[PDB]
């Protein structure tokens, strides 16, 4: 067990990392379905590499590799949607955003590094259940943390791993750099709490609306950084139909799995969205969600960067298909 892990590092820290072109990770329309585990890790390395993070922060191939692997093994396999392939698909979206969407040219190297590390670990040790549930079931994690419970935990984990020996991919940073990187990373991961996205997006939607929004502003920026996290965290909804189709199948199951617990240990009725029996009201529930949470946001993101439009396009394109379905 420890053995398969350790050879995994041997084989990984010695394979050639293919180009970004080869890996089609520059694409908003990208899919992981056909990649192996080892391949995904490789992409990740290519990500760090092509963002100049590797060179500008004196990362040793050895270390990065260990770290990456560590994150991989700290996502739960038994968990339907919120496994490693989610953290990975998010980071790739994030990567695609900075490159093809052209945002890199809009922010610092400290920020880029933080976003990537955050994107990768924003859901660590997610146990396939929402903040709402853990709160209502008096999980000890709820006793520990106040608000954004899970997201606080995801970070507690991220940080535990970065402090692990031979995982200090940050070891190269000045203490001041390190110190503020971590700050941003904390902000990023917490931002993936849907509740904060909601309690904050209004502000941001207006600066856009009023043609006032401007990156230069320190605060305006860090808000946007939150919004960007959300944007990638659920980028799945902006995928080609056949993909969106299938990934919506996982979210489906994971929800329904929680729904079961709600009436088996909690003895409450689950929301329809997690009510396994109501599987036939999926598509409208999808529609309402896309309307409520998504289009709104990806629109904004394009006003900020035009080259980010494919996200908006793919989003409404799926909304189209769910709506049809909802009408059988």
């Amino acid at each position, epitope marked *: 067990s420890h053995m398969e892990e350790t050879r995994e590092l041997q084989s990984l820290a010695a394979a050639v990392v293919p180009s970004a072109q080869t890996l089609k990770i520059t694409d908003f329309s990208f899919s992981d379905f056909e990649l192996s585990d080892l391949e995904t890790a490789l992409c990740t390395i290519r990500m760090f590499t092509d963002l100049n993070l590797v060179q500008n922060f004196q990362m040793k191939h050895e270390v990065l590799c260990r770290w990456i692997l560590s994150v991989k093994k700290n996502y739960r396999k038994n968990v339907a949607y919120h496994n490693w392939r989610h953290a990975f698909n998010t980071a790739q979206c994030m990567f695609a955003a900075l490159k093809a969407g052209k945002i890199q040219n809009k922010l610092t190297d400290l920020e880029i590094l933080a976003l990537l590390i955050a994107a990768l670990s924003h859901d660590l040790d997610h146990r396939g259940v929402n903040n709402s549930y853990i709160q209502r079931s008096e999980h000890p994690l709820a006793q520990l943390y106040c608000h954004s419970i899970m997201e606080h935990h995801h970070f507690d984990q991220c940080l535990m791993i970065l402090n692990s020996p031979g995982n200090q991919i940050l070891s190269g940073l000045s203490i001041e750099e390190y110190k503020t990187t971590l700050k941003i990373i904390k902000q990023a991961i917490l931002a993936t709490d849907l509740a904060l996205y909601i309690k904050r997006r209004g502000e941001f939607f207006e600066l856009i609306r009023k043609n006032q929004f401007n990156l230069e502003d320190p605060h305006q920026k860090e808000l946007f950084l939150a919004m960007l996290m959300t944007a990638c965290d659920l980028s799945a909804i902006t995928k080609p139909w056949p993909i969106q189709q299938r990934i919506a199948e996982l979210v489906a*199951t994971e929800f329904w799995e929680q729904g*079961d617990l709600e*009436r*088996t240990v909690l003895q409450q009725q689950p929301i329809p969205m997690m009510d*396994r*029996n109501k599987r036939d009201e999926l598509p409208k529930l999808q529609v309402g969600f896309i309307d409520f949470v998504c289009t709104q946001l990806y629109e904004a993101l394009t006003h900020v960067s035009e080259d980010c439009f494919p996200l908006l396009d793919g989003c409404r394109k799926n909304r189209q298909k769910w709506q049809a379905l909802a009408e059988q």
Partner: antibody
Amino acid sequence: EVQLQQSGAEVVRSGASVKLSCTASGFNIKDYYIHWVKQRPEKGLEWIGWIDPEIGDTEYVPKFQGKATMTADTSSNTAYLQLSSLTSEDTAVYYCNAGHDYDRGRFPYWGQGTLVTVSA
Amino acid sequence: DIVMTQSQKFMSTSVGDRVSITCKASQNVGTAVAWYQQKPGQSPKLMIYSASNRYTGVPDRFTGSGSGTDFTLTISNMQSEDLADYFCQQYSSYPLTFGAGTKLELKR
């Protein structure tokens, strides 16, 4: 081993009601859907519907709406089938069976069946 | 409702024979079919599922094949204990439906 044990045969009067039981041993019904299927003399099996003993949710096929009522109880591991306003046509062997709730429809466990004979 | 047709109500066989039982679906059910064995007054038992997979514990002499609308349960080297009723079932979609059964009988 995993077993579904059904109650004995009943001879009932037309217009009355009868309640059949199906008890699980060697396993727990909670994570299964319990289905009931009818078999008339010289005829093939016909599905009646299922119950999710975990939440109590049931689904009946239209021919049995108001005819059959399924209930379950996970602590005693027993599922029940109530048949009301019985007629000659309800005479048949009734089976309860079980399959994983996340499973499309394989029936790995079946009770031995209960013969119900209705007559006035 | 999808009709599962088992054209043969009875089939005479002998210990040692290779026997095949057919089941036809009225609609495309993919490989979403299962076969059950039943003896008088006893619980049916799962034998084959997904059209060709043997359920745990069932002897290797039972196999199944087919897809779409034509399915077949095959018993290689039939044994005395194999004399029983067999029926297919589709679980492609609701309502779940069954064939009317085929009874294996002894030849003399």
